[PDB]
Amino acid sequence: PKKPNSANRKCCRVRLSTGREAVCFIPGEGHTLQEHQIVLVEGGRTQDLPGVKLTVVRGKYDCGHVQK
Amino acid sequence: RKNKDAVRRPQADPALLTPRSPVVTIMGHVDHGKTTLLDKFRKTQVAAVETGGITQHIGAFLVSLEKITFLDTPGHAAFSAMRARGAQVTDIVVLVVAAVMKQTVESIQHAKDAQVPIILAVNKCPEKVKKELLAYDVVCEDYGGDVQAVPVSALTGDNLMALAEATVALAEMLELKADPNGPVEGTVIESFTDKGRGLVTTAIIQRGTLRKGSVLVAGKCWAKVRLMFDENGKTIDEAYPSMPVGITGWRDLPSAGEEILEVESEPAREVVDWRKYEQEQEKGQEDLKIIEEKRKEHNVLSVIIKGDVDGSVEAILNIIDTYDASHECELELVHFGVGDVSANDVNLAETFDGVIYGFNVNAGNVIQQSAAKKGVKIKLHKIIYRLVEDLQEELSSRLPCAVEEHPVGEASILATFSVTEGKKKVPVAGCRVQKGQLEKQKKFKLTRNGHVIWKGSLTSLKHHKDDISIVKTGMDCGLSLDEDNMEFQVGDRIVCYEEKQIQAKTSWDPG
RNA sequence: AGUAAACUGAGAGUAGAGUGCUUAGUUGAACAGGGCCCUGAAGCGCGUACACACCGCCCGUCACCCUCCUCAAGAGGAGACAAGUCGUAACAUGGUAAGUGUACUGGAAAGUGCACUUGGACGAACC
RNA sequence: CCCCACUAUGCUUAGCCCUAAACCUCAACAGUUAAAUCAACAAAACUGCUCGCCAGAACACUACGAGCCACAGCUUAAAACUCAAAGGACCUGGCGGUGCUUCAUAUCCCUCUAGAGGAGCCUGUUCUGUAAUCGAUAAACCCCGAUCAACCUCACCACCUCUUGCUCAGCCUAUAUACCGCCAUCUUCAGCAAACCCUGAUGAAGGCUACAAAGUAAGCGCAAGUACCCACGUAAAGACGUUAGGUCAAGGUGUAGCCC
RNA sequence: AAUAGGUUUGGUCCUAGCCUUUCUAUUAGCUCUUAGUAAGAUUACACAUGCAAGCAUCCCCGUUCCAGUGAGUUCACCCUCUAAAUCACCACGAUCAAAAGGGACAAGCAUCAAGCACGCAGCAAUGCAGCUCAAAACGCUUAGCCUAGCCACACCCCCACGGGAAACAGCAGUGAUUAACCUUUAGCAAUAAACGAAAGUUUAACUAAGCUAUACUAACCCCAGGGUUGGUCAAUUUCGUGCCAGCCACCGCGGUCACAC
Ligand SMILES: Nc1nc2c(ncn2[C@@H]2O[C@H](COP(=O)(O)OP(=O)(O)OP(=O)(O)O)[C@@H](O)[C@H]2O)c(=O)[nH]1
Ligand SMILES: [Mg+2]
Ligand SMILES: [Mg+2]
Ligand SMILES: [Mg+2]
Ligand SMILES: [Mg+2]
Ligand SMILES: [Mg+2]
Ligand SMILES: [Mg+2]
Ligand SMILES: [Mg+2]
Ligand SMILES: [Mg+2]
Ligand SMILES: [Mg+2]
Ligand SMILES: [Mg+2]
Ligand SMILES: [Mg+2]
Ligand SMILES: [Mg+2]
Ligand SMILES: [Mg+2]
Ligand SMILES: [Mg+2]
Ligand SMILES: [Mg+2]
Ligand SMILES: [Mg+2]
Ligand SMILES: [Mg+2]
Ligand SMILES: [Mg+2]
Ligand SMILES: [Mg+2]
Ligand SMILES: [Mg+2]
Ligand SMILES: [Mg+2]
Ligand SMILES: [Mg+2]
Ligand SMILES: [Mg+2]
Ligand SMILES: [Mg+2]
Ligand SMILES: [Mg+2]
Ligand SMILES: [Mg+2]
Ligand SMILES: [Mg+2]
Ligand SMILES: [Mg+2]
Ligand SMILES: [Mg+2]
Ligand SMILES: [Mg+2]
């Protein structure tokens, strides 16, 4: 993230149904997303990540819920 | 979470039990006459009308001799699960042997696993077959075994009547009875997507009577039965136990071999939801482990698969999973599905630079044009081994060329000279060619008492103050290397060689 | 100013231990006049893009990654990321006042010529 | 940047180019000073009418399109990606290789005296070394904690030994960037501030002129008194705060940590 | 945008953007007891199957309607003229309403500024050289609209002789596609339409049902989940974490005492 925040935000590049490649943040602690997996991505920018304006919807398609 | 799962009913009461037809599955090796025997029983010919004369699907047919449900399992090694599914659902197994092979042994093992009676059919007629089967725990009545052996000739239609008589006798001995009333219990034999009838499942009813409008659940899927048809496509108003049926109306496509249970009403969904949740939990546990394992720390062929039926897709995926040449080339399965090649498959292949493989599925002109525009390669096959060969060819294409080194000549150094040319001291090795010849174009390597010192091409080949391209055997030649760091001794050796690129074939074997 | 300098003695602490520290005494000077040029202080102002406050802020060139745009896919541009490197261009009269147009020149901020602006000052009776 | 020489150029004629902080950054015309004058600064506040222009910053006096005698040009002029700001004017403070004036009294300069930096030694520190402490470490550390280490001191290292242990345990273990306690420093200053009151249109803020014009001020500090030989000098004193200044190793103590 | 609120800065004032608070709709996550009513593919992409137009003494009439979709798009409204249709038959007319004529009629772009024959006179021959336009002509892109309903389309070639080719934008349903996903129900009993002189017949119009928390209404002896808790903005105890994991609509939090994970 940009200053003054510091972290390793879990992001993934995905090709959308519109044919456009975009970077989507993966919220929640821990994820098992892999190549060729299908996700549902919604809006809502990640504030500390420049250029990231999408977010993976946890609990839909291959992206499971956050494991307690 | 509360358990809302729909479970199989307890074993039917003896009073409620009613005699039913038998389910007989024909199993055996490739080209052992299973399809021909089934054609003779069915009074119709379909072995001739096939792609390559190979049974690639498990089909159930209600034959009227009495009535029996014959299941034609494929004999190929690819569709092992298919055969297993038949063994799981059958009551009697007709093991067809041409006058014992690997797939026959596998089918025998499946029948033993399922604890089902076996009737041997010696097609193309025998004693040698029974003696061999003695090793595989298939003992004939001539050898004191329960298994009945019938020599038959399917092509000429000989002795088939006695085979049917033995099947009927074994069915009568088994006394197959089931409850023809109450909630329906059955098993999926196949599932596919018809462009007109939606998601369709070929199933076999095990208990209860299925009727239009019955709400069924199978795995993560559920349906409100919309059309029940037979093999000929005609609608049937009821589906008694031990009756094949094509059921339409599935909201999602069930996996082959999944049990089907009838429920009270659609708000079924809950049951499906519960099952989904269970699966998620299982995956979640695995996910948790993997995630924890991470948190404590802190030549790529991509293939799309589109098949006509889920069973064929499963067989192809099992074949793919038997890939063991990941070191030379990595085979990634981007996406597998059921049905004709579609826009999503083309987009996925384009995204990952993959290749679409279509087993018994089509691709319209629009789809083909889109794939050509996007550089996607669609490969449609109708035979499983053809698809396997094509996949092997693609994998070999992905493999890098293999360089073959052929020795051309050999020369031994005699003297070392220092020539002053262009203000530069060039070390020159006086070499005598012992065997073969040395060529300027061909590469060279330096050998020091068996050790390999240098590998490359000469910067200058010169003999008797004249440049000669090829020096014959016994000809002296001064050799100069491009590498100045190389030291030339009195006893060094030089081996010339020609390097030719050769096509490399994949080490993976489908068997 | 009994100050600097030189000489002598005593005490603290130690069983003993300092060329050290504290302290008493003795002999005992020179310059002390000019200056706001240097460095600071005060009074009245002036300027300020700094405010953990000039050890501030800040500009441009020379690598990687990311997004977008214009493109004969090689490339250019913008923004973000923000490093390291070369200078210190701007903010105080920023140490050559700053800037506009334009022309030429330069590793880079930028320099210079010409005209213009105050979004600078000229200390605000005489001296 | 400073000095020297010279060219394009500045001049004339004939065409072009058509840009300026082309700004008096304040449109033309007609009218008012009435009040409800008026964010701030600037060059007071306005009214009627009309035209031109403006609509977050940056991209951007840019790209593309178009027009032009212009061909590295001028005019018109976007969009995408990005940010929660950008901006205008102020208040207070700091700072200025900032102006004027007055000073510095061991003192800023020229000056006066004795030294240090050169030598040997004593002693401290850095660096190297060792199995072998720690802390201070610009002014405001460096014969410093020590008015003091051969054993002890000692908290260091190596080996050996003990486990309710001198203690109703213990720890010189971490944190002085949690502190008390004692201090350095500006200070070789003179200001800090309760409670009120007034000005700023009731903004941050500010509050003095003695022929006085909004300040009054308890209290702390300076000063006065006091110690030594005076009233002089030297001591002592020296506030609020500054440097997250020094000390967890004077002792105590928060938090965290070890308990064969 | 309002009764407004947070947010520029060391601080204040002004301008300004962004966001919050409110009300809907769609989708997604988690969750969900019942009843009534209303509403209900993302797609002018392709469609399996079943039905959706008959009636009637033969001729005729209807199948040009209803039903559907929103691709295209200033054919919708007012006036003049007057076709077809109803009033059995003329109505020497009324109602209704085509074509034709006049007028009015969406949004963005001027970096779309010129269009290039877009006019007039004459009976005609032919003559004049004009006509529209910065008060937006011409052009490009977007869009069903002004909702008792109206306009347009009916697989495409605007049309449909013809060609491409064999058509669900009728109902139920399906494939593909999308974040988007209603039953392959019944009856003509009510109304409407078609036919008949009529008893009547037919109708996937419609009626009565089916599925769905999309909405509203109402209830339940038992049956409640979702989000949030630093400020705006109602509401946190203790542990773990230690600028990491993570959170945030904006300001921002997290570096060993976290009201923000
Ligand atoms: N000589 C002989 N040949 C026979 C007889 N029955 C069948 N065949 C032949 O054997 C072949 C059997 O192969 P298939 O018809 O494909 O039957 P299958 O054993 O199920 O083979 P798969 O479908 O590939 O598993 C047929 O092509 C016949 O021509 C027989 O009774 N005698
Ligand atoms: Mg066969
Ligand atoms: Mg400078
Ligand atoms: Mg300057
Ligand atoms: Mg200049
Ligand atoms: Mg120059
Ligand atoms: Mg000069
Ligand atoms: Mg002159
Ligand atoms: Mg001028
Ligand atoms: Mg310009
Ligand atoms: Mg330009
Ligand atoms: Mg251009
Ligand atoms: Mg010395
Ligand atoms: Mg030391
Ligand atoms: Mg230290
Ligand atoms: Mg010692
Ligand atoms: Mg210790
Ligand atoms: Mg401190
Ligand atoms: Mg003192
Ligand atoms: Mg005093
Ligand atoms: Mg400190
Ligand atoms: Mg320290
Ligand atoms: Mg549409
Ligand atoms: Mg343009
Ligand atoms: Mg449209
Ligand atoms: Mg169609
Ligand atoms: Mg048409
Ligand atoms: Mg339909
Ligand atoms: Mg579908
Ligand atoms: Mg919906
Ligand atoms: Mg009638």
Side-chain angles (χ1 to χ4, degrees):
Chain A
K2 73 196 187 186
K3 302 284 186 70
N5 298 347
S6 70
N8 302 300
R9 309 293 180 183
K10 271 62 174 177
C11 296
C12 63
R13 182 173 277 98
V14 304
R15 187 169 199 204
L16 309 168
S17 62
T18 67
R20 185 182 76 88
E21 295 148 24
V23 183
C24 304
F25 179 60
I26 306 156
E29 282 186 346
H31 74 81
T32 67
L33 286 180
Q34 307 193 46
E35 193 175 21
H36 321 303
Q37 286 198 359
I38 316 298
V39 296
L40 194 76
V41 301
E42 71 190 346
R45 75 186 178 93
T46 313
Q47 286 79 340
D48 51 353
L49 291 169
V52 175
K53 312 178 282 294
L54 295 173
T55 294
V56 177
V57 177
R58 304 305 304 254
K60 191 66 160 165
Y61 297 138
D62 287 3
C63 197
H65 280 283
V66 178
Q67 295 315 293
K68 303 165 158 175
Chain B
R1 185 192 288 259
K2 283 193 192 177
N3 194 310
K4 301 290 187 180
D5 194 89
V7 301
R8 201 177 63 190
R9 280 189 290 162
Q11 187 172 17
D13 181 84
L16 295 164
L17 281 165
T18 306
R20 67 176 171 81
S21 280
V23 176
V24 178
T25 295
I26 302 170
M27 310 179 64
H29 190 80
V30 178
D31 294 354
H32 272 209
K34 304 177 292 306
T35 308
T36 307
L37 183 73
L38 180 56
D39 291 6
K40 279 291 199 180
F41 277 138
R42 285 178 67 198
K43 219 183 179 180
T44 76
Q45 297 175 334
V46 296
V49 185
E50 284 181 354
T51 55
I54 170 166
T55 307
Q56 308 194 91
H57 303 108
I58 184 168
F61 314 103
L62 184 62
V63 295
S64 50
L65 299 182
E66 289 294 319
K67 281 189 177 192
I68 306 172
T69 303
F70 280 151
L71 275 64
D72 186 26
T73 50
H76 205 273
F79 320 98
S80 291
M82 271 192 211
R83 275 191 298 279
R85 280 200 292 276
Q88 287 293 322
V89 308
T90 194
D91 284 317
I92 290 155
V93 169
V94 167
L95 185 85
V96 186
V97 180
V100 188
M101 299 300 304
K102 188 177 288 188
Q103 312 311 321
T104 309
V105 175
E106 186 186 311
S107 299
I108 287 163
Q109 186 48 56
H110 291 326
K112 294 312 193 182
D113 293 8
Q115 307 179 23
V116 295
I118 304 164
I119 283 167
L120 176 77
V122 179
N123 189 359
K124 311 207 187 173
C125 195
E127 296 300 319
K128 166 170 169 172
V129 174
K130 305 162 185 78
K131 286 183 181 176
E132 194 155 358
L133 287 162
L134 301 182
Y136 304 103
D137 193 74
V138 171
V139 193
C140 167
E141 286 175 347
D142 309 339
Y143 306 78
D146 303 351
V147 167
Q148 325 169 51
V150 184
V152 291
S153 176
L155 181 71
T156 75
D158 184 4
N159 198 1
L160 310 195
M161 179 65 75
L163 183 60
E165 290 277 21
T167 312
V168 169
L170 187 42
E172 285 181 50
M173 288 296 294
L174 275 165
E175 301 178 1
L176 305 174
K177 308 197 171 175
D179 186 9
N181 293 320
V184 176
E185 300 179 9
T187 300
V188 171
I189 310 308
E190 200 72 273
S191 80
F192 48 88
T193 302
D194 185 271
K195 284 190 179 175
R197 306 194 280 198
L199 314 183
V200 191
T201 60
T202 295
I204 285 174
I205 306 308
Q206 303 259 7
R207 187 182 168 173
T209 303
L210 191 70
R211 297 189 174 76
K212 184 179 163 67
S214 290
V215 190
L216 298 175
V217 291
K220 276 72 161 159
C221 295
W222 78 277
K224 184 162 176 279
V225 171
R226 167 179 302 129
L227 186 76
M228 287 156 44
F229 58 90
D230 57 355
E231 56 262 37
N232 293 342
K234 294 182 77 181
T235 306
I236 57 179
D237 297 335
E238 285 170 16
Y240 282 98
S242 290
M243 277 189 62
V245 65
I247 306 154
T248 69
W250 293 90
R251 311 303 195 257
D252 294 277
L253 199 59
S255 175
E258 202 57 87
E259 181 185 41
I260 317 173
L261 301 164
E262 196 197 338
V263 298
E264 296 176 7
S265 65
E266 308 170 43
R269 287 196 307 273
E270 179 174 76
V271 167
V272 168
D273 299 352
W274 160 258
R275 288 169 181 182
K276 282 178 162 149
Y277 172 80
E278 279 187 88
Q279 185 210 31
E280 282 186 357
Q281 288 312 88
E282 302 311 87
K283 180 182 172 188
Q285 291 296 317
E286 182 197 1
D287 295 341
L288 187 53
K289 283 184 178 191
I290 289 153
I291 288 158
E292 274 185 321
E293 172 61 30
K294 287 195 297 189
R295 287 167 65 84
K296 188 190 177 175
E297 172 170 65
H298 175 91
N299 49 13
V300 176
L301 174 58
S302 291
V303 295
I304 301 279
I305 304 297
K306 299 297 299 306
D308 64 324
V309 290
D310 65 348
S312 291
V313 168
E314 159 167 29
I316 295 153
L317 295 178
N318 293 346
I319 283 165
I320 290 162
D321 286 353
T322 54
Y323 185 68
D324 50 358
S326 62
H327 58 276
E328 61 180 22
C329 177
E330 284 185 343
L331 191 57
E332 295 292 319
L333 174 76
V334 171
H335 165 246
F336 65 95
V338 160
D340 289 1
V341 181
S342 59
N344 280 354
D345 318 298
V346 176
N347 291 334
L348 283 167
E350 177 201 18
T351 310
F352 294 111
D353 281 348
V355 176
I356 302 161
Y357 282 83
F359 187 64
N360 288 298
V361 296
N362 309 328
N365 276 333
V366 177
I367 291 298
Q368 295 280 15
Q369 288 163 345
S370 65
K373 262 190 66 163
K374 290 166 177 60
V376 177
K377 282 206 309 197
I378 302 161
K379 293 181 182 293
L380 305 177
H381 289 284
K382 299 185 180 172
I383 306 163
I384 190 151
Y385 64 68
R386 295 290 201 174
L387 188 141
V388 171
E389 291 163 24
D390 198 359
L391 188 60
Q392 276 189 313
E393 283 183 350
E394 282 290 327
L395 283 168
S396 304
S397 299
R398 297 319 178 77
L399 287 189
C401 277
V403 176
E404 164 173 354
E405 179 174 339
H406 180 58
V408 173
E410 188 176 5
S412 58
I413 190 169
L414 307 172
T416 53
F417 297 92
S418 290
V419 187
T420 306
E421 292 286 355
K423 305 172 185 173
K424 183 177 181 180
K425 308 297 178 180
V426 177
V428 172
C431 296
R432 223 176 198 193
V433 188
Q434 301 182 342
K435 51 185 67 178
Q437 56 176 18
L438 312 184
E439 302 182 6
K440 180 62 180 181
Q441 295 177 336
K442 305 310 183 195
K443 292 159 179 172
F444 299 86
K445 67 178 178 186
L446 182 64
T447 297
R448 262 186 186 176
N449 205 18
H451 306 282
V452 180
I453 302 299
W454 189 68
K455 278 258 187 180
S457 185
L458 295 162
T459 188
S460 185
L461 164 52
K462 192 161 175 165
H463 166 71
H464 191 62
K465 299 181 179 180
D466 294 330
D467 196 319
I468 177 172
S469 299
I470 309 180
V471 285
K472 277 83 176 183
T473 300
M475 188 79 71
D476 298 4
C477 59
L479 302 193
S480 58
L481 311 187
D482 196 8
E483 189 81 0
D484 210 350
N485 302 322
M486 292 304 126
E487 271 188 2
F488 312 106
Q489 304 296 337
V490 183
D492 302 335
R493 296 175 184 260
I494 296 180
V495 180
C496 180
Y497 57 91
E498 166 174 10
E499 294 217 318
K500 176 190 170 193
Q501 275 186 353
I502 315 297
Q503 172 51 41
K505 295 180 180 179
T506 180
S507 313
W508 169 57
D509 178 67

